[PDB]
Structure formats: C-alpha cells, structure tokens
C-alpha cells in the first residue's frame, strides 16, 4: 500500500536548524510530488508548497517563500523539509502529502502521521505536582471530585494515572496550558463517593519521560496550614 | 490569494442525521474544491475531489456539490465515525488554500456542569505561588462562562482555562479554569469565588472558601 512515513518529534531552541524528512513506499516515488503542511497548535491546515522529485523543482507558498526549504532525494525516496534559523513561531504539525492528480487538480490522497516540532526557549524540567482537595466542610453532596496540578514541566507530555492504574472511572485529564513562563501546567481531576474521602486513599502518579522524573502524590487536606 | 471560508465553524449533531457543510471561495474556483476529514492527533484524509468526486474507499454518505464559488458537503446518515473535523481545499490555483476548518461533534441533552473550588495547596504556598483550581465536571453544551472573584471584584489576565474533548461515555465536556496569584497576593484577600453560567443553570453557581477557614 501507499505509505509516507515521517520522521519523529522534535523539541529545538530559536536558531537552531532542522530538517525533517518524509518517507515514501509502496509506489513509484518520483511520479508524484509532495506537498508540505502545517497546523499549528489549535488551528486548521496550512499548505506551504511542494516539490517534483523528478526534476527537483519547488514552489511554496507566499507567506513561506525564503522561510523554509523543501528538496528530496528519489534515491531514497525521501522528501524534506528545513529551517537554517528556527522561531518558537515554527511550533506546529508539519505532514508530508503526495500529490494525485484527479478530477483535473491535485489532491492530498496520501498523508504522512505528521512530525511535531516545538520550538521554544525553554528548557527541560519536571512537573511539580500538588493536590486538588476540597476544603474540609465543603463537600456537600454524595459525590466530590479530587485532582493533581501538575505545574511547570517542559516540553509536552505528562502522563497521570491514577491509584497506579486501579482508577479510571471519572478522571478527566485535560490539556496542557502553556503558562507565559513558558512552561506548561495541567490538572487530572476524577470524582469519588463523599464517604470514602476518610477510608479510601487516592493518589495520582505522574510520568515525564523528557525529564525522566515520576512524582506520586497522595491527595488530600490537612486539618491546618 | 483565494480564502475559503467554512460554515458553520462547528455543530452538534446526531447519529443518522443528515448534515451539510458549507465552504464559500472568495472568487471562482470552477470545480476545483476537495474535502478532508481530520480527527484529533491524526492525518487528514481524502473525502471528495473536483466538487463531487468521492474518493476511493469512502463511504458514499459522503456527498460533495457545488461550482464556482459556493460548495457543500453533505453527509447522510452520520455514523459514529464521523465525528470529526472537516476541512475544504481549493486547487484551481496556487497558492493552494484551505477553510478554517468545521468541526462536527455529537448533540446531546442539556447537563448542568458540577461545580468544585479547590484551594491552593500548602506545598505549593511555600514556594511563593498559590493556583486556586475550579472544576466544572461534565456539562454540555460547551458554552460556558467562567469568572473569578477574590474579595468580591471581577479578576481579568491571570487565569488560563482548558476543556477536554467530549466524553466517550456521556458526551459531555469538562471544564478547568486555574487563577494563579503570588503567594504575598494570595495572602493579602479573603474571599475566593469561581461563578459559573451556563445553559443548565437556572442562575449562576458560585463555589467559594474563606483563606483561613478552608
Ligand atoms: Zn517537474
Ligand atoms: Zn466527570
Ligand atoms: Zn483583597
Ligand atoms: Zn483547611
């Protein structure tokens, strides 16, 4: 089948260069061009150009023209895409598409998964990570939700389980917001039986492979502070 | 330097509903709209091509017409795997352009959010920061109003705010608004209040604590 297989994530610094590389099989790579996309964080598709691999010629887009550079190599079958000078700005989803002429216009028939690129100043940290618990005469109804503010962690991603793994009825684990700091800050929340507030323990554990860190923290509300 | 505009930029609808999207060039661009599907963390994917052309391997409840300026996309009896969002494309000429994008998510009864405060926690407070957490726990629709309160006046620019996607039990949103204050800030007020509107609600929720009495 006609596959684009792209390479993996990239966290970069402003001023570095990259160059990212989509790979094709399962057809004949120089009879069709490639087009490059990006989304950014949020946002919808943006075409950026393309290039024939079979002459090596390129056009991009006006807003892209002199900011990017797209080449290939049909030897490998490789396409690619490349910054001598990267902006935090540059932070989205880049895809590679290949190009099927039909119905008299290109069209994108086959997508690469697409490679993240994060472009910040930022450094690698762990997450902090603090209880959410509710006030201690608070809880009013049959039902009270606990959590964990995870804060200050660089770059994406955190995983949260919850009682290692045994709860997953409940939790909401919602998206990272990226503080002006620069670092992100996520909660996990799930909510529990009023009545086992006092019996039961809960505990969310806390997984950043970039920064190898893994933090547990047992929820709750002391009776002074 | 040809925009497509998509409408509407989202809607809710039902399993077996027929929906239509509408994509609308800024000028002529003949028969040359294509339509993706995207979902969350995935590639796009081919629907329809030359206006009404599907695709090969695509269901044919997708449907595309269309000429000139003003396109549609109409998918009959929505299938779960549907929810999605759906993209259209012009390629009468570069550069190629894409709409903004609508998104098509799954309708469902009115559910008042439940509404939680928490306070900042006191391993937090020691390093000189205090985030004050409301939760708004499965509501829908989407819209709702968040506003914090600290001693009784209206706070702006120091709060941030994320919502995940529906639930894949009840199909309903959830809603976390963090207030992030210094600890000497923190410190200095009294009364700390999230008040909450939203459709479900009758008048506005409102969950507070007392520093000091918390
Ligand atoms: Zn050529
Ligand atoms: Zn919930
Ligand atoms: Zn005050
Ligand atoms: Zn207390």
């Known amino acids: 089948e006609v596959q684009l297989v792209q390479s993996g994530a990239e966290v970069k610094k402003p001023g570095e260069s990259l160059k990212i590389s989509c790979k094709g099989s399962g057809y004949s790579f120089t009879n069709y061009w490639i087009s490059w996309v990006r989304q950014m964080p949020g946002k919808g598709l943006e075409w950026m150009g393309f290039?024939?691999?079979?002459?090596?010629?390129?056009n991009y887009a006006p807003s892209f023209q002199g900011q990017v550079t797209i080449s290939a190599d049909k030897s490998i079958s490789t396409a690619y895409l490349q910054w001598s000078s990267l902006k935090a700005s540059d932070t989205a989803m880049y895809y590679c598409?290949?190009?099927?002429?039909?119905?008299?216009?290109?069209?994108?028939?086959?997508w690469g998964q697409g490679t993240l690129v994060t472009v910040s100043s930022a450094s690698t940290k762990g997450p902090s990570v603090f209880p959410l618990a509710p006030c201690s005469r608070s809880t009013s109804e049959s039902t009270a939700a606990l959590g964990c503010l995870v804060k200050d962690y660089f770059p994406e991603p955190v995983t949260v389980s919850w009682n290692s793994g045994a709860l997953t009825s409940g939790v909401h684990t919602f998206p990272a917001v990226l503080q002006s700091s620069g670092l992100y800050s996520l909660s996990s929340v799930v909510t529990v039986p009023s009545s086992s507030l006092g019996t039961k323990t809960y505990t969310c554990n806390v997984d950043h492979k970039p920064s190898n860190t893994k933090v547990d923290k047992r929820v709750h509300h002391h009776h002074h502070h | 330097d040809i925009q497509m505009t998509q409408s509407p930029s989202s809607l809710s609808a039902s399993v077996g509903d027929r929906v239509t999207i509408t994509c609308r060039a800024s000028?002529?661009?003949?028969?040359?709209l294509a339509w993706y599907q995207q979902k969350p963390g995935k590639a796009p994917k081919l629907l329809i091509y030359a206006a009404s052309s599907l695709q090969s391997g695509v269901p044919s409840r997708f449907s595309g017409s269309g000429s000139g300026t003003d396109f549609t996309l109409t998918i009959s009896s929505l299938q779960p795997e549907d929810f999605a969002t759906y993209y259209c494309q012009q390629g009468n000429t570069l550069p190629y352009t894409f709409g903004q994008g609508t998104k098509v998510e799954i309708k469902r009864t009115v559910a008042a959010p439940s509404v939680f405060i928490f306070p900042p926690s006191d391993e937090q407070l020691k390093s000189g920061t205090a985030s004050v957490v409301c939760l708004l726990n499965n509501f829908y629709p989407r819209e709702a109003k968040v506003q914090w309160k600290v001693d009784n006046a209206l706070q702006s620019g120091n709060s941030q705010e994320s919502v995940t996607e529906q639930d894949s039990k009840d199909s309903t949103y959830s809603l976390s608004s963090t207030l992030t204050l210094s600890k000497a800030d923190y410190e200095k007020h009294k009364v700390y209040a999230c008040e909450v509107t939203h459709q479900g609600l009758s008048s506005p929720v409102t969950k507070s604590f007392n520093r000091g009495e918390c």
């Open positions: 290039i024939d691999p079979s002459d090596s010629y390129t």
């Open positions: 000028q002529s661009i003949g028969l040359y």
């Open positions: 598409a290949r190009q099927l002429y039909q119905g008299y216009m290109d069209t994108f028939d086959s």
